[PDB]
Amino acid sequence: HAHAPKVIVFISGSCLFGAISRSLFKKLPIPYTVVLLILGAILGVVASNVPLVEEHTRDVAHMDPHVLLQIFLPVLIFESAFAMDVHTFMRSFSQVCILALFGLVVASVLTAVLAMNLFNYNWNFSEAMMFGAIMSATDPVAVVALLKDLGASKQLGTIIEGESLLNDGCAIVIFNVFMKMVFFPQLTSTVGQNVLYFLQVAVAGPLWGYAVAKVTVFFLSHIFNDALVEITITLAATYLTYYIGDIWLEVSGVLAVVVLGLIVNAEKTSISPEVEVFLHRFWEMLAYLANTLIFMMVGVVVTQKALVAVDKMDWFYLIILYLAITIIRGMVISLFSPILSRIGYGLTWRNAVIMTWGGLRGAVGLALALVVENLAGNDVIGSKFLFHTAGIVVLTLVINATTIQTLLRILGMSDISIPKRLAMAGAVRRIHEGQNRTLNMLKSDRFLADADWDIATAACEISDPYSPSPREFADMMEEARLRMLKAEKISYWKQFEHGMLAREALRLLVQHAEVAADEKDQFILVDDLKKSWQIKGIYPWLKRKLEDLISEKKIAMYKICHHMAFEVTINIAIVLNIVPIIMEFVVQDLQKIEDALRISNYVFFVIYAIEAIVKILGLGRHYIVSHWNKFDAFILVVALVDIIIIKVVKLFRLLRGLRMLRLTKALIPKLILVVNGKINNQLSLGYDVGKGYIIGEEEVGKIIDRMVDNKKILRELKHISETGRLQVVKELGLLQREHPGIAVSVKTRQAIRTILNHSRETIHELQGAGLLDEMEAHKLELTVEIKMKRLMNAPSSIPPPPPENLLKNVSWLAGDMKLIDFIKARASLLHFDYGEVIVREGDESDGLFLIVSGLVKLYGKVFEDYLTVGNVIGEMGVLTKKPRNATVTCETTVQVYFITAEDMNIAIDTFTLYPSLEYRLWRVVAIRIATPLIMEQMAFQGWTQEKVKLHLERGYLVDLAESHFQFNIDATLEDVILINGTAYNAHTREEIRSPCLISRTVHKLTFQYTATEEPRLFVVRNA
Amino acid sequence: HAHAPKVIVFISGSCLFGAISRSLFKKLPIPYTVVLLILGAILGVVASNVPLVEEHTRDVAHMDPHVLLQIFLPVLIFESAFAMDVHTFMRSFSQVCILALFGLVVASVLTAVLAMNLFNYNWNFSEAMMFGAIMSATDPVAVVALLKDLGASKQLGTIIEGESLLNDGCAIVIFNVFMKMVFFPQLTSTVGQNVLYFLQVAVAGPLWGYAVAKVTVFFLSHIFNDALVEITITLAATYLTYYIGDIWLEVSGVLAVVVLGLIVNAEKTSISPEVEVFLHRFWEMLAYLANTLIFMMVGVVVTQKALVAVDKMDWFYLIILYLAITIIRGMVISLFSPILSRIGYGLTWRNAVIMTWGGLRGAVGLALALVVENLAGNDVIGSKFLFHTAGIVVLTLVINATTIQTLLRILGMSDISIPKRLAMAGAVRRIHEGQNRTLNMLKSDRFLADADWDIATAACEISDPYSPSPREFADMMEEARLRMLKAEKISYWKQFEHGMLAREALRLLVQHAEVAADEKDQFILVDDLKKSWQIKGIYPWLKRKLEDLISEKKIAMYKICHHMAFEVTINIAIVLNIVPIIMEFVVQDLQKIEDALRISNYVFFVIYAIEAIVKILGLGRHYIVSHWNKFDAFILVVALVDIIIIKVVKLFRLLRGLRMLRLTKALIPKLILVVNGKINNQLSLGYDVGKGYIIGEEEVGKIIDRMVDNKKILRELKHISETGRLQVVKELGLLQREHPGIAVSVKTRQAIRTILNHSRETIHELQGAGLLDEMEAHKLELTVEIKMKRLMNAPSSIPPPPPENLLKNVSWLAGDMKLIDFIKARASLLHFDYGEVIVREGDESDGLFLIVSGLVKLYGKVFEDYLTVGNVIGEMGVLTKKPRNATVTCETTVQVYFITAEDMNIAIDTFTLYPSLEYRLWRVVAIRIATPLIMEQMAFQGWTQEKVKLHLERGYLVDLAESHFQFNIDATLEDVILINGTAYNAHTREEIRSPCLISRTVHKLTFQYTATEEPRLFVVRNA
């Protein structure tokens, strides 16, 4: 049949040709795109003779320009943006913006001048600027792929990629401008019109993209368990944004799509992870299809109607143009180098050379050249444009793309560093050992004894891809420093893999560690981490001001005046009435429409009059005290004036202003929520990085004790770590005090994340045991994922709980309502000011302190520490009745719940059960004492501190009421720690001190009925 | 600009409307498709008045029929096929084929008769058959989703889905036929032409799809580390198959796409797993887009130009038609029920009612109705077709789709079974316990003490979604039987999750277990498992015959006559020459072409003459003995006759036949490989299921010893398990003997799979420790995945290794070339026939037997067992010098390497090192003895037998040369087992027997220097 969609044949053929090209030239240096161009040229030449191939090709090869752009360019641009590492892009944004915007301007201008002066085509400035804009387009994929693969200068890869993104967007903008100037020349517009056009293309585009992106992520964050909807929304958002911006609004669509991609890639937390991984490959595949189609269309067109108008001088011009554009890009990079060196990551001459050589052209330039070809028609301009663009693309893909690897080798950037080589060698050796063990296991299997082991061993073998004095003191200290940095990086990776750290915090910590590792005796100084948790003053200032604006404490039928429905109704009334207020006056700027709209205006005036009467008769004389109500009264005044009544054009403005401005009262709270959200993001990263650093320091300080030899260097390293940890904890406490609600929200979020992660772990564990079918386990996992996604929509400003809630949430006051009542009755609330001492070292343990507000410093004896809300001081005091262990000083205004030692003795005596109160207290103290010991003995193994704390949580405290000697049964036992008192090994009668871990070899423990030091011992069990 | 692609707006709008519909009506019973139809109707009515909306809609709403089909129908059909559970579909294929093909025929015929007689439209039979074909289309999604969710009658879900797939395909075929009969009426064709047309649509379609699918999977199985290529190949294959089949070949494209989807979904092992999971969602999303677009187009068209021609009687006809089609489907199901009950899964009346009520119509029927609308144009036929189709779709989506849940409730199918409720309750309780533990852990954290715990606890809470006598003896035996079945299912799931079982074997075992669990005292009888490993005689017969054909033992310049290049060259010559032999004669059926082709024919005759002279002068008088060479000589005879010369038309056939038939010699070996592949698949499933059953029986036989009480029922269960295991092992050994090479290939494949799985596990383990960066670990994982995918392309017929290789691959002869030489010198090869006894019980241990071929039965004293190739007999004999433990009887012709006890004593004495030969022997024996003990004590925990064997592999044998008493240090120790001799606990002097596991409580062991029973003890260590 004649009306078959022949485009399908061409599309699928391009797919298969791309498959063949990639498969065959996977290992060769020449990229597959050149093969696609050659195949397209062959296809075009054969079509020129065979009419059937012409029938199958014409539909796509001679496609309309607008179709080409509005289908392919959004795909290419959004795939480029959605592939970005947005965070390093933003941290190098100024550098990339300079290098991209100003670099494109200069390069395109110089290329246009070259085209006008060198070429004999006698082009005008508009056509030459079009040419330069096309030539300035860039394609980083083949170079950034290598830079990401080699791992050298990870910053350079993203600088190149983002520069390509931005220069491609701006090049498309410039191309559209000059294309409209040359092929659709309108009348010479006024300078004001040109300024408006500039604002419309350069400013309105990003704002349109930003609005669409924020709306898109808003909806995405409220879709649960519907992947198809999320993917469909993303796709439709991209295409609809481009179409609406470029056509309806005449706004720059490419920039809008760039902003949309960046914003969604940043807010990517709003997207379910599985559809995120789906979307990455989906957009990669769409971009691949677009690239293949564009290259094959270029081949067809260039062989059909471009080379026919090519002369000998054109080749010389092509060579000169290639050299010229290379030199121009190099000159631009070197010229801005003085500026870029002082901004962001800076530039080395090696990085600059890679940037200069790696500037490949690609699909964007070819698409624009095809547009020029279609628009020019019979004119030679299109032929020359397509010829030169394709020639330079071919040259870059043949010379630059193939020689970039050799250049990276020559400049010394491709060298794998020694640490990576050592890590790979160790991993390969461990893999070989595991494979040998598995082979030995299999050879013993009766059902596999006859298997050909030579073939198996050959098949499963994995190979290494990379295959007392000052000098001595300096060597030893460098060794210790590098080893500590490696241990810290390992700790951060372990923290992340178990879900305790977000990716951003891990990346910050790791990159800081690496930077410190290549700068003399530079450890990870806290000052660099400081910038993570430093809140810019703009957000706190805005919060303070805006919250002042909505402070109704001057004010706080009457029942309705303070009921929600009233405000909701009037808000809806204003928002609805705004639509007529726009439509009517724009229509005036048909009488049966105006009169009806003015009747509706009477109706809305009646609604406002009813509302004003409501407020007056409810709030009495207090109504007009509020400035908001003053504005409302002025609204009613204007309404009376203009309903009783230059008057017309006066009314058209007054009834717009007085009515549109009334919704700012409802707007401001949402703006406060936005400010809270940004502060929450910054504070969340601050907490993540600070806590990660503290935990890593704690783990490494006990790792190094067994892996660094000299005592003095060990002490120096410990001192450095302790100083950093103390500073970090103090800063985090002060931040908590500055913004209570945000800190509470962050901590609740972290708690929920941890609980849900461990719940998913339990689900997986009991699925592996086969106790749940895959489908039911999947259902439970779906519930977990839905809860986790709803977590992202937390209020972000949870009000701080009152002291009573903190008292009733203490670990050893969980449940047990009667004990909570007793303690709340006995407790007293004490307030202290800055610099005061709550309690001193050596004092008698007169009671507990539960910090309900503030921050305290704990000095002792080198024992400096900081405590904040929730922490309770003096448990050891009341339990063992020994003197105070530390001096408590307030670093800020502090409020503490004080419970006397006598009230604690009374509570302990009065409350007794299997979950004994004293049992709970000693359990908490014993876990806190035990965790450091278990890490000190076993931090060299893969256990994190979280694993140790959960391991102890599974344990129990030995009673010694049913016995007076403890047997290491090793069934229902995994490890033992002593806390209080002294014990003796039954057989050898060796002595164990109070805080000592029980050695593995020890068999049985003997105790004494010494009430003064009634021994307490902790045990953990396997099953 | 005017030439903007307005289709983009409509597509993206349909996307957003679908998103809104799904989001809003997620919980309501009404499906979102009805909402989409209503929205499309609103859009059409508003378009009829607003011309701009008409401009934006016309491009899609009034789309060409061919575009509609060739874009959407392939997507819908391939998504339906690629979503299939192909294996249960194939195991119910006959039932589905009856119910679908004959059911569609009857239903469509009856619907057409109803249309002709009831409706006043005065339709002819062609139009009525079109109507019936449209009405017969089905959409199971909303019902199969529930059946898969509830888990009741999993077979019913796939029966419905496959019936829908096949009936939709056949309905499209019938619609195409009658559409061509009515709207493109050609001249009345002859009956032979009709038969050819039937073969072309019904037969050639499936074959075209099969060929394309096999080629596609062939290419997919040779693409490594390129996801984009795989996805692009799949997409292009689907569309190109449909286009080529329907247009170029005029072959049924829908059936071709159905076969393509099924074959790819079956050969899905050829696809990289990540792109498999990508592709499932990709095709689901494409189908979703197609559905949304079709529904919105229906709304627009029906509101614009269909309802305008609707009358009151049409609604009555619609109601009558709905009732009629429902009754017809029910009648068809009940009428075929006698046949379907005796085929496959059968049918209950409840399942039949669900099938009758769940037959929803959908996108396919609407698309065909739109085709009829576009083709009919101004005729009322299109209006009536679209009206009735849309009305019935709406009615089914409103009545059937909403009431199917209530019907499943009424029929008692929605009830969750008690075991699932218990499993869910236990999982929820464990999750609550884990969350409470995590909460206790967090509350102790100093940095989270101030978090609002009420909010967290409320957020993280997961809730249960489902919220001595004959009578007593029968209850107890049922309890034990059900408990054993549950344990077996758990064992199968554990085996699968650790990668020891393929999914198919697990599903077979689990479904067999469930079937046995609901049928009186029916355990898992081996007879059901037998059909898994039973090879159909067709493949062995074909292998034997074809391998006989290529037996060149009559035959096996001369150097070239037996060199590969010769045969390769002549094969290429024939395949190349066939192309001219086709082109020239078809062109005859321009003279400058024929003469050149005949010169080329002379050239190829010269090549054949050179080849024949080659064979003659090389092979001498032996040349003509081979029948293949007789045919070759006859080829040369015909070539001479027709080159020297009715003659023309004689030549046109003779030079085709004699030349095309010569390539069968090269074809046959590949066909033998195909036969080997199918036998390999069947044998691989047989081994998987048999070994899984054996392992599950071994684990459950030791689980039950601690969880079933009465001794007699325990003995009965043990006897049943032992009988099943013995039969399974015997059958597997016999299968191995029948097909040696295939068994060797399967076992090598399993070994490589296990090794690579454990290597990936090690990579993940050391990544979690942070010892490798994510990128390098990803590189190693990529290498592992590439090796695993290449594993799928194994030869499948690895030749059996010779006895020397088996001797040099024994576990304790690994490496150590000198010992291998000694043993190969000392060893002797003995041959035994059926029924002979190699050695008897109580005999003196005179030497080892290594089975190099055959199968042996080991009787002893109730000790019946079977051993096969690779297994070695008599190790205990030579080590402990005790009498023979069992009687060895040959169940088939057996060959054994015999090494005398004296040679073993000499080898032991002569060879001594840290990896001592006696140490190796005792290590093997100790592991074999120890594994049962560790399972017997700890099979109740989550450990599988593989975990136990690896756990022992990490261990070592205690020397007792540096000491005579063993200390349970519990560091560098995890468990202890005794093997030989007797030991005593140092403190209590309690006695430990030779095979006993050392108790956890025991402290230290004391031994004796009794050489007669020199004690051997095994130890495993943690770190």
Numbering used by the authors:
A (entry chain B), B (entry chain A): 71 to 537, 570 to 658, 671 to 703, 725 to 780, 796 to 1011, 1031 to 1192
What does the paper say about this structure?
In a recent patch-clamp fluorimetry study, the functional integrity of the domains was confirmed for SLC9C1 from the sea urchin Strongylocentrotus purpuratus, termed SpSLC9C1, identifying it as a Na+/H+ exchanger that is activated strictly by hyperpolarization and modulated by cyclic nucleotides (cNMPs). Specifically, SpSLC9C1 adapted to mediate cellular alkalization in sperm only in response to chemoattractant-induced hyperpolarization.
In contrast, all membrane-embedded domains were better resolved when reconstituted into nanodiscs, yielding a map at 3.2 Å that was used for subsequent model building. SpSLC9C1 adopts an inward-facing conformation, similar to the majority of eukaryotic NHE structures, with the residues of the binding site accessible from the cytoplasm forming a negatively charged cavity. The voltage-sensing helix S4 is in the inactive upward position, as no activating hyperpolarizing conditions can be established in detergent or nanodiscs. All positively charged residues reside within the membrane and R1 (R803), which is homologous to R368 in Shaker Kv and is supposed to cross the entire membrane electric field upon activation, is still high above the gating charge transfer centre (GCTC). Further, they form a cytoplasmic dimer interface and interprotomer interactions, with helices CH1 and CH2 of one protomer wedged between the helix pair CH8’–CH9’ and the CNBD of the adjacent protomer. Another interesting position is K939 on CH9, which is coordinated by E300, and backbone carbonyl groups located in the dimer domain.
